[PDB]
């Protein structure tokens, strides 16, 4: 006894806890938000069978009014072996190091001696929850050198009388339908395939994603005697509607680069060749491109209109146009404008010189900063402007890299509010490679640069569906923050400016002080309640 005492403390969930962190639970939320509590343990001896149970979280005026807690999850660690090449000053530690990120879904875990272990508690608070102060405890148990150890940790959730429903922010995370590294491996069109697709869709809507990228080329079949069959595309759309994502439908890219970074764009077509439908890439000004798109685009518009989906849809042309391939990009736009004038066009862009060619602009964050007057004008002209991050920007800009403070993920959506950008895009929902994402955090193809840890995936492969990361949680919370700030700004625009300006000081400069952030959140909640 003494070496068996369990050290327990509570840490703000915006603070990343490392295996060697030193010791230091209340959450404050609107109805409609998710409350997170992070409870951290350490023991001088190994622990077997660590388990936590959330007791009833009850209203003091009425023990009958209880919040429903999700199953408890354990914070998992991943080896970040190589760093962001241009890191921020506030980089949490220098690689190589083990960082907290995946939220594991295990009933029990082992802890090695002297290793700090976070326990992550999520309480989703429905909009119809009665406001007030909910209290209870988390019962932690396990076995240390024979003996059963146990402790209860007091926790409290204050539920403010303000309702956050759907966030008006548009959010897309590009998703690949794949079961790599899972304990299941469904084939396409199997029941389990569609069940997994549903589980992914639910995970996305539970994290306030309300846009999904679906390809009308890849998920259609063609007969070319043209007849287009959209039945697989439709199954996807109905799943994403039913699980509460759609929202909007983001049509997959029609084309891409012919070769290298500055090469011209080509567009995919379908052709009948020797009895088979083949796909090939052609110049957008070609007769082959004109013949295909003159039939495919009207078929797509008719289909969407007939299904009541046309006003929810926007079509991608080709990703990340730059100044040197602008002509071929615009030639793709001309095809769409000609055969499908009713279709809205969306693009993740670098070049700004696309007025009339696209309707939903998605500049990379640093390009938005640099070309801000351009993008404000496009909004005045009636276009939508969102933004993205990826491998870039690095430096001091906000992003969702594992090396960054977790507030840099959450404050992405404060950048949306401050600057009036009405959506956010990211390529990297679940782009796992052939190596495990748990043990190989810096994805890399041979002869090209590695991706910083955090960039290609924000969820991890569980046994039969996605596991969240702590960054997925922070992203969801930021999307709810944007809705709160938007509700405030309708009543009191000056108070919403003051609050956002506390944390978003410029495009590339923030206040990530977690205590300051909590005091801002509380003022927001108090002003709105």
Numbering used by the authors: 27 to 50, 55 to 255, 260 to 563
From the paper:
Beta-N-acetylgalactosaminidases (β-NGAs) hydrolyze the different β-GalNAc linkages of various glycans to modulate the length, combination, and abundance of glycans. Among Groups 1–4 and GH123, the DE motif is located at the same position, suggesting that these enzymes adopt the substrate-assisted catalysis reported for GH123 MR-β-NGAs.
We used deep-sea metagenomic sequences to discover a β-NGA, NgaDssm, which is the β-NGA to possess dual OR/MR-type-β-NGA activity and low sequence similarity to known MR-β-NGAs. These findings suggest that NgaDssm is an OR/MR-β-NGA. The active site of the OR/MR-type NgaDssm from Group 3 has a cleft structure that enables passage to the −2 subsites, as in NgaCa, but it also possesses two additional β-hairpins from the second and third β-sheets of the (β/α)8 barrel domain (purple). The structure of NgaDssm (Group 3) bore a striking resemblance to that of NgaLy and NgaP2 (Group 4) (root-mean-square distance of Cα atoms [rmsd] = 1.5–2.3 Å), while the structures of NgaLy and NgaP2 are identical (rmsd = 1.0 Å). The increased number of residues could potentially reinforce substrate recognition in Group 4 and GH123 enzymes. Additional structural analyses (comparison of crystal structure with AlphaFold2 predicted structure of NgaCa, comparison of apo1-form and apo2-form of NgaCa, and comparison of GalNAc-thiazoline-bond form and GlcNAc-thiazoline-/apo-form of NgaAt, NgaDssm, and NgaP2) data are illustrated in Supplementary Fig. 13. The anomeric hydrogen signal of Galβ-1-3GalNAcβ-pNP (between the GalNAc and pNP moieties) disappeared within 1 min for NgaDssm and 10 min for NgaCa and Galβ-1-3GalNAcβ appeared, while Galβ-1-3GalNAcα anomeric signals appeared after 10 and 30 min, respectively, due to mutarotation. These results indicate that NgaDssm and NgaCa are anomer-retaining enzymes, similar to GH123 enzymes.
